[PDB]
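Troubleshooting log. The previous run stalled partway through. Resubmitting the same two chains, unchanged.
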Amino acid sequence: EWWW
Amino acid sequence: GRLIYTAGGYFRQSLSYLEAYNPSDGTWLRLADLQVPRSGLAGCVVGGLLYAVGGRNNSPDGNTDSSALDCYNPMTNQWSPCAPMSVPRNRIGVGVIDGHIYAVGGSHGCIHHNSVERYEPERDEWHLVAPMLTRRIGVGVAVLNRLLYAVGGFDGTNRLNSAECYYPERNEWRMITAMNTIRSGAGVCVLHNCIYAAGGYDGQDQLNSVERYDVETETWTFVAPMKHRRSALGITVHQGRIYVLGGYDGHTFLDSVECYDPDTDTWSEVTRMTSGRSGVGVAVT
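Second attempt completed without errors. Output:
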């Protein structure tokens, strides 16, 4: 989950 | 005229924005930056003060997971640091009972916490409480009837549909009924007598579905779904309506803010954030  | 505060977030890197939305007139107001950029943090309110807890700063210099608790005073437009948590907690969940801030789970590097700790504002101290039955990061937390719920998240191996309830008077956790869907980084809040779990990531897709746990029936039910699929969204309650803010939909970092009216079981897009971001901390005062 790179997006936070 | 109470406002929805959004702190930090992610877009390219961890962000420092503090902005406030007024739902009764549709305006946004830029406020003082966080001293340290953060995403994967949580926001809460105690005695009219906004607290930002945990998260991480992924930046050009590398990544630093945060043990920080910081306090913003809307009257002075100033941030003040508070006592650090016992350990860094990225992708933390937070709830408030009896004026105390409960910091739940989250991660420090590769360690996924089951541990939980409690902040007393009047002493500026953290104390360990009973650990959860499950390690959870990207956990959603809500408080109803002075009981704290930890919903979903990621245990280091699997994303979770499970949930559990903390009873302060006995300092113990128990499993409750599992959700219908695995959700990591969902929006979790309380409206009326229900705990809502909106969005999240199931291991494959970002979700637009929204299920709620009625505490009198012990059952999870899908209500109307959001217009946008979203994980790592902010969520809160203002005047009997749910507001969800931002998140990642699988392709875009959203600026969308949707509003759920449980009287009509309908979501409407009410505003846009000034720029798209995920991983915000959100609260109302």
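Takeaways: Chain A touches chain B through three residues (CB under 8 Å). Chain A has no helices and no strands.
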